[PDB]
Amino acid sequence: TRPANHRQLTFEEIAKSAKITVNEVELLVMKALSVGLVKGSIDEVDKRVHMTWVQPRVLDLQQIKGMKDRLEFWCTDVKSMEMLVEHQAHDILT
Amino acid sequence: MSEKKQPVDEDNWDDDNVEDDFSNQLRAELEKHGYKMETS
Amino acid sequence: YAKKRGWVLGPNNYYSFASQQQKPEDTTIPSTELAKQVIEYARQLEMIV
Amino acid sequence: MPYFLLTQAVRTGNLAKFNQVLDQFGEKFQADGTYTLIIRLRHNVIKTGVRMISLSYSRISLADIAQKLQLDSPEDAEFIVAKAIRDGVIEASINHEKGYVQSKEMIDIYSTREPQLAFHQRISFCLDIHNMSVKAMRFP
Amino acid sequence: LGLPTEAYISVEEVHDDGTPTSKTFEHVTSEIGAEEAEEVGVEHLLRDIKDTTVGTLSQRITNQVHGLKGLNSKLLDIRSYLEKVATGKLPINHQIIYQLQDVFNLLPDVSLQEFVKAFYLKTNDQMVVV
């Protein structure tokens, strides 16, 4: 749901979403790393669980829409930066 | 080569750096430097 | 000073607002001007013989 | 001899020898051709003490620096440092609660975009030394 | 554009698991190798620009230009793909669905560790050349 921006999630939101207590989210994520759907880390100096999600799935078209937009945003930046390099370095491009 | 603007115009070897650092700080270095122990 | 600026007397205690900065710098963001500086080097290295 | 006697009394925290040298050597100071030393040095002598202390002590109080600077007034020591911070003598801060005067905190400058900006000064200047020295020589 | 030869492989499977049986031509990557005793026959036939090895800073920029002109071309190609993969054209492949998903949420991002390290070695990589 969060597109890798602030994937450092705290224990409180999992405890709210999975309706599980604080003393069981750590046994929860040790199982999930042992399964192999994720290879994230667990920090407790901020009590925030890090997520490196590595196991994809099928998705519906509604979540394809934003995925196609983030491709176009990626496309229109990579193109625009190419215009800036070609503008700057044309005289020694030859 | 003069440039048409002149209004008017030994003991050590090189000791400016120590003297710019320490000029007069009781160079006998014994009477307070060695004699703090009577004061404390 | 109370009518013009703040320094409002309350319970025998003034209140001055903080006029400091809070700018969250990242500084890898001006990476274009750095590549601009790298290119204009090799421009000036070459291009005149 | 007169300027070395001048910079001796300035860098030290003395006044009566300084005025004696000023009274003795003023005839040369007029014969040299600068008169503004009479007003610009008394700012220097009072700020030489506060710059040396702020360079030395990381955190000195106001009541100590007032007695160290033979000042006999523990009230304007906040005002001297406020002039020192404003004039750019030293970057410090006065905690106006009991007289805490702190100083710098960090010493890392290396990975904090310092060196590249000086380096861009070094490249652009010396290639301009280069190309001017290129054109100045192939005359035949 | 940048388009060398292309190759497939002869495979006989069902299709994936839950789809009817098929052929499904699988791709094998390709290259144009070049051994000795033909490059002298190759180089002597070029004789027009010939593009000598390591270039004096102008060939390398063009390598990054048309290295990136191949990048947005693949971006535009896959842009036309996603605009026809659902816009009602053909049965979407369940394979290619998660094959595209593990690219976007697996690319790295910027942090504090990347910042302090970059200006550390960019200072180091620059000052020698300075």
From Swiss-Prot, chain A:
User: Where in the sequence is N6-acetyllysine found?
Assistant: 16
What are the record's GO terms for cellular component? Answer: cytosol; extracellular region; ficolin-1-rich granule lumen; membrane; nucleoplasm; nucleus; proteasome accessory complex; proteasome complex
Where are its TM segments located?
none
Q: Supply the alphabetized keyword list.
A: Acetylation, Proteasome
Could you tell me one molecular function GO term of this UniProt entry? structural molecule activity
Superkingdom of the source species: Eukaryota
**Biological process (GO), any one:** ubiquitin-dependent protein catabolic process
Q: Which family does it belong to?
A: Belongs to the proteasome subunit S11 family.
Tell me the subunit arrangement: Component of the 19S proteasome regulatory particle complex. The 26S proteasome consists of a 20S core particle (CP) and two 19S regulatory subunits (RP). The regulatory particle is made of a lid composed of 9 subunits including PSMD13, a base containing 6 ATPases and few additional components.
Relate the protein's function as given in its record. Component of the 26S proteasome, a multiprotein complex involved in the ATP-dependent degradation of ubiquitinated proteins. This complex plays a key role in the maintenance of protein homeostasis by removing misfolded or damaged proteins, which could impair cellular functions, and by removing proteins whose functions are no longer required. Therefore, the proteasome participates in numerous cellular processes, including cell cycle progression, apoptosis, or DNA damage repair.
Q: What protein does this entry describe? A: 26S proteasome non-ATPase regulatory subunit 13
Q: Source gene? A: PSMD13
Swiss-Prot record, chain B:
Q: Which SMART domains match?
A: DSS1_SEM1
Which tissues is this protein detected in according to the database?
Expressed in limb bud, craniofacial primordia and skin.
Primary location = nucleus
* InterPro entries listed in its UniProt record: DSS1_SEM1 (IPR007834)
**UniProt KW keywords:** Nucleus, Proteasome
GO CC annotation, single: protein-containing complex
Task: List locations, semicolon-separated.
Answer: Nucleus
Recorded hits in Pfam families, A to Z, give:
DSS1_SEM1
Mind listing the GO biological process terms from this record?
Answer: double-strand break repair via homologous recombination; mRNA export from nucleus; proteasome assembly; proteasome-mediated ubiquitin-dependent protein catabolic process
Q: How does it assemble?
A: Component of the 19S proteasome regulatory particle complex. The 26S proteasome consists of a 20S core particle (CP) and two 19S regulatory subunits (RP). The regulatory particle is made of a lid composed of 9 subunits including SEM1, a base containing 6 ATPases and few additional components. Belongs to the TREX-2 complex (transcription and export complex 2), composed of at least ENY2, GANP, PCID2, SEM1, and either centrin CETN2 or CETN3. Component of the homologous recombination repair (HR) complex composed of ERCC5/XPG, BRCA2, PALB2, DSS1 and RAD51. Interacts with the C-terminal of BRCA2.
Family recorded in the similarity comment: Belongs to the DSS1/SEM1 family.
**Which named protein is this?**
26S proteasome complex subunit SEM1
State the organism named in the record. Answer: Homo sapiens (Human)
Give the gene symbol: SEM1
Curated annotation (Swiss-Prot), chain C:
Query: This protein's superkingdom?
Result: Eukaryota
**Oligomeric state and partners?**
Component of the 19S proteasome regulatory particle complex. The 26S proteasome consists of a 20S core particle (CP) and two 19S regulatory subunits (RP). The regulatory particle is made of a lid composed of 9 subunits including PSMD8, a base containing 6 ATPases and few additional components. Interacts with DDI2. Interacts with TASOR.
Family, per entry: Belongs to the proteasome subunit S14 family.
What's its job? Component of the 26S proteasome, a multiprotein complex involved in the ATP-dependent degradation of ubiquitinated proteins. This complex plays a key role in the maintenance of protein homeostasis by removing misfolded or damaged proteins, which could impair cellular functions, and by removing proteins whose functions are no longer required. Therefore, the proteasome participates in numerous cellular processes, including cell cycle progression, apoptosis, or DNA damage repair.
Q: What is this protein called?
A: 26S proteasome non-ATPase regulatory subunit 8
Q: Which organism is it from?
A: Homo sapiens (Human)
Q: What is the lineage of its organism?
A: Eukaryota, Metazoa, Chordata, Craniata, Vertebrata
Full-length numbering of the shown residues: 302 to 350 of 350
Curated annotation (Swiss-Prot), chain D:
Which residues does the UniProt record annotate as the domain PCI? 1-108
What domain of life is recorded for the organism? Eukaryota
> What cystine linkages occur within this chain?
none
One GO MF annotation is: enzyme regulator activity
Output one GO BP term.
regulation of protein catabolic process
Q: Name one GO cellular component term.
A: proteasome complex
Instruction: Specify whether Transferase is a keyword of the entry.
Output: no
Where, per the database record, does this protein carry Phosphoserine?
61, 73
Signal sequence residues: none
Arranged from A to Z, the UniProt key words for this protein are:
Isopeptide bond, Phosphoprotein, Proteasome, Ubl conjugation
Which protein family is named in the record? Belongs to the proteasome subunit S3 family.
Note the subunit structure: Component of the 19S proteasome regulatory particle complex. The 26S proteasome consists of a 20S core particle (CP) and two 19S regulatory subunits (RP). The regulatory particle is made of a lid composed of 9 subunits including PSMD3, a base containing 6 ATPases and few additional components. Interacts with UBQLN1 (via ubiquitin-like domain). Interacts with ERCC6.
**What function does this protein fulfil?**
Component of the 26S proteasome, a multiprotein complex involved in the ATP-dependent degradation of ubiquitinated proteins. This complex plays a key role in the maintenance of protein homeostasis by removing misfolded or damaged proteins, which could impair cellular functions, and by removing proteins whose functions are no longer required. Therefore, the proteasome participates in numerous cellular processes, including cell cycle progression, apoptosis, or DNA damage repair.
Q: What is this protein called?
A: 26S proteasome non-ATPase regulatory subunit 3
> Organism, per UniProt?
Homo sapiens (Human)
- Span within the full-length protein is 358 to 497 of 534
